[PDB]
Design a protein around this ligand. Structure first.
Ligand SMILES: Nc1ncnc2c1ncn2[C@@H]1O[C@H](CSCC[C@H](N)C(=O)O)[C@@H](O)[C@H]1O
Lengths: 53, 255, 262, 66
């Protein structure tokens, strides 16, 4: 899961959203997203995301 | 048994209503018509007894008519209800908006004497107002399916915010069709009138698409199924001096 | 300081989004505008630090222009933000649908360099589609504030659904009262009768606020509207009066004919 | 009772299981949550105004003048 579990938590939890918006990269890595995944998010490449998990 | 149709809204996990989520949790069986795999994974963890109705669509590049497939979906839902199962259908956005299968199933369930209802959810339109920071009530609002707008005579009120949905398939019974839409809209809106291409976000890490461009450029824009066209007002509101007169007042009396 | 505007929907407790509820729970302070006392209680148990925006409406007897009321609400919200509070504004329904306070507060917060955003919620209209079994996507739909429909030049499309919000104050020009009169409503009927027959069936809709309450779905001829019992919370649905008409001009350009419409 | 009323309506509004139970046997579910006779009567008659009394106690947020 990972990406799914993270996206699920982020989307439901206002406190996690807060933490996320302050330092997206760190929070994503803390939740076990890969450098590729993190990069896809920060670049806004939704397509590459689909093809990661 | 019984039937309840709920929506997930647009955003993963977070946009579903508290009660709607609860309905999924406590269902004997869930029929899903969810768009993506994140959505699917999330649902499966709420309730393991999930049937993906997307399976009824054409598979392995087979040929299959929509109306036949909707019928199979609906029949699959009703079979659960008839069997006596507390059945929940999980749709995207608002379950009664761009959604024939919900309406059909609920209709058929009622006719067979089963309890059946639709729970409202957050639609793409609800998201649009929030994201663009526009109140439909500010100067009024009109929404049409883009193709309906082209096939039938729907004169817009240009003081309102006009929304044209499913812009990506406008005029399908391409830049050619969109150009025809431009010429149509150009009856009321100048070619340099700024319009907005809107796509609601579905992931919490994802920004909504809010692309401002002149009307004339619409044909050269890349569109997705979810794309919508916002056309802001071309005219300011003007006083209805007749009705104000009947009311025995003037513009100066408006507090 | 920051501002998040959220809606709570129409039904008690269950119609708020999961994310929106979270926002209320984690807030330093919540400014609320809710339907009733059950909702107020529920909110307070979510987050006890609630300021009720109701207080800014005119009290019994007082004459107050609601422009002032809204201006004072916005100001109260911004004072919290300016003091450095993580502020949530919780409005019934959708915080940006026939509601100015949230858009105003967000605009102002942004202007002063604060973080601000609005979260969508379930509006009375979302409820109306569900309760009446209408798919507004395919059929199309229009919305207007009733008074604005009377005071300004609006032209409805009588082939598609027409919602008039705030029908209970239709024609109340001062913005100091919270109900209209039969004679005002009668003028609205006369205005509508350009497009809709007097015997056209209309629907007075009120979404349920409690889970034990059925919605109000009152079908009546348009002519009878002036005699109807209206609540501040009432919305008027006017279904199509005319059948769809072919857009011959655009059909020809697409290279198709009425016969092909399938 | 007043608090209990509010708490029941709150749970009922959020909890699908309780909701489905309610729709099956309204009176029974209400009694099992400690509602009184007259609370139940008020629910069954749909007397919203009584319910507010039994719990113990203007919604326009827009205008159309421009
Ligand atoms: N329960 C309800 N049923 C029907 N219409 C309602 C309603 N609650 C509010 N409205 C409509 O909204 C108007 C108040 S303005 C508040 C709108 C609210 N933010 C929303 O999204 O619904 C009322 O005059 C009526 O037109």
């Amino acid at each position: 899961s990972g990406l799914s579990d993270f996206f699920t938590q982020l989307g439901q939890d206002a406190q996690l959203m807060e933490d996320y918006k302050q330092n997206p990269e760190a929070v994503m890595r803390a939740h076990g997203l890969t450098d590729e995944q993190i990069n896809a998010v920060m670049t806004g490449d939704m397509e590459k995301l689909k093809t990661l998990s | 048994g019984s039937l309840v149709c709920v929506g997930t809204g647009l955003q993963l996990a977070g946009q579903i209503s508290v009660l709607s989520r609860s309905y999924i949790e406590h269902a004997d069986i869930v029929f899903s018509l969810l768009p993506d795999g994140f959505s699917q994974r999330w649902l499966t963890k709420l309730n393991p007894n999930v049937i993906n109705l997307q399976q009824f669509y054409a598979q392995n590049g087979e040929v299959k008519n929509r109306r036949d497939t909707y019928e199979q979906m609906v029949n699959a839902i009703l079979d659960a209800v008839r069997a006596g199962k507390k059945t929940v259908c999980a749709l995207y956005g608002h379950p009664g908006v761009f959604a024939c299968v919900s309406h059909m199933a609920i209709t058929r369930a009622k006719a067979e004497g089963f309890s059946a209802k639709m729970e409202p959810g957050i639609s793409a339109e609800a998201c649009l107002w929030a994201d663009l920071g526009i109140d439909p009530g500010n100067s009024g609002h009109q929404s049409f399916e883009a193709s309906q707008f082209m096939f039938f005579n729907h004169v817009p009120d240009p003081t309102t915010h006009l929304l044209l949905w499913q812009i990506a398939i406008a005029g399908e019974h391409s830049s050619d069709r969109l150009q025809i839409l431009v010429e149509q809209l150009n009856q009321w809106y100048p070619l340099d009138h700024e319009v907005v291409i809107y796509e609601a976000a579905n992931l919490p890490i994802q920004a909504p698409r809010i692309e401002r461009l002149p009307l004339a450029n619409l044909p050269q824009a890349h569109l997705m199924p979810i794309s919508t066209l916002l056309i802001p007002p071309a005219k300011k509101l003007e006083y209805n001096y007749a009705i104000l007169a009947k009311l025995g007042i003037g513009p100066e009396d408006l507090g």
